[PDB]
Amino acid sequence: YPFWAQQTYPPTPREPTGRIVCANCHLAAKPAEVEVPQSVLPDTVFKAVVKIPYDTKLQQVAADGSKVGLNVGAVLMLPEGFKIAPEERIPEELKKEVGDVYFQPYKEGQDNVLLVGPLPGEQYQEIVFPVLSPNPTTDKNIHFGKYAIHLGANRGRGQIYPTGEKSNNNVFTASATGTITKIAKEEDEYGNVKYQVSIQTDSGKTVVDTIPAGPELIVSEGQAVKAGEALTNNPNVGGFGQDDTEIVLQDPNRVKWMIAFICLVMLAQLMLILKKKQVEKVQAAEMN
Amino acid sequence: TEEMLYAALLSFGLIFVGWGLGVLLLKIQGA
C-alpha cells in the first residue's frame, strides 16, 4: 500500500541510496518500467507511461488463503515543477488512456512525487500519467535542462505489515533443533486455518511454531533439519521493481538557434568545397 | 534500450546516405 510508505516514512519515499523504500515490505522482485518523452516543451501536457507487467492470468494467496487476483501500485518521482496536468488541459484521447486513477502527492507541497494504488492488475498493466511540464518563464525556480525521473512499481501483496508482524505471503522457518509430531489444521470461526509444528528430543526444547494458512507444505513428518528450514514454500507471486529515465525540459529558443548554426556550418562547408572546385580548374591548366 | 538501437541504426546508416550523396554530387559535375 503506497500510503503505508507515508505512514512509515513521512519525508521521502527514496533513500539516499535511491532504494525507494517500498522494498522494505515487498521483498519480491519483478521488472518495472517508466516511459516518458525524451524532451518536452515548457507548459506542455505529455504522457508518462508506467509499465507494471506480469502474467494476466495468475493469482496469489489472500489473507484467508483464498486465491484472488493481483493489484498493482507504483510511486513516480517527477522533477521539481512537474505535476499532474489540470483536468481541462488533458485531451480526450489522453483521458481515455488514463482511467480512474487517483494520483496522490506524497505530502503537502510535493506535487512532483505521486502515489498510485491499489489498482486492478488485470486492467492496469500499464498506467498513463497526465503530466504538465513546468514553465521556466513564469517560474524563476525552474530551469531548462535534463532531469531524472524515478519509479518504484509493485505487484501482489506485501510480506510485512507496518506494525512489524509478518504476513501469509512469504515463507516460514523453524525455532531450534527438534523433531515434529502432529500436523493438522487448528481452524476457527472468527479466525482461520492454522498449522501446528512441534519440536522435541535434543536437550529439552519443546516449542510450537504456529503458521497461518496459505503457504504449501513440502514436509511430511518426522524431521529435524536445524533451524531455518522452509517447511512452507514460497506462495509469493507478486513483485516490486524499479526503473529510471531522463526527461529534458527543452527550451525551443535553444533548438532554433542550434538549427540556424547548423545551417550556417553546412552552407559554409559547401562554399569551401565549391572553392576547391574552382582551384581544381586552375591547377589543371598549369599541369603542362 | 529504445533510444540505444535507434541511435545505433541512424549513426551507422546515415554514413552511407552521406557517402552516396557525395558520389552523386561527383557524377553531376563529372568526375
Binding site: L270, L274 | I28
Partner: peptide, 28 residues
C-alpha cells in the same frame, strides 16, 4: 516518422543549393 520527412526535405533543400550554385558558378 515525421523526422524521416523532415530529414528528406532538409537534405534535398541543401542538395538543390549545391547543384544550383555549381551551375551558377560554371555558367559565369
Amino acid at each position: 516518422i515525421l523526422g524521416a520527412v523532415f530529414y528528406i526535405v532538409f537534405i534535398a533543400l541543401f542538395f538543390g543549393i549545391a547543384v544550383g550554385i555549381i551551375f551558377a558558378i560554371k555558367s559565369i
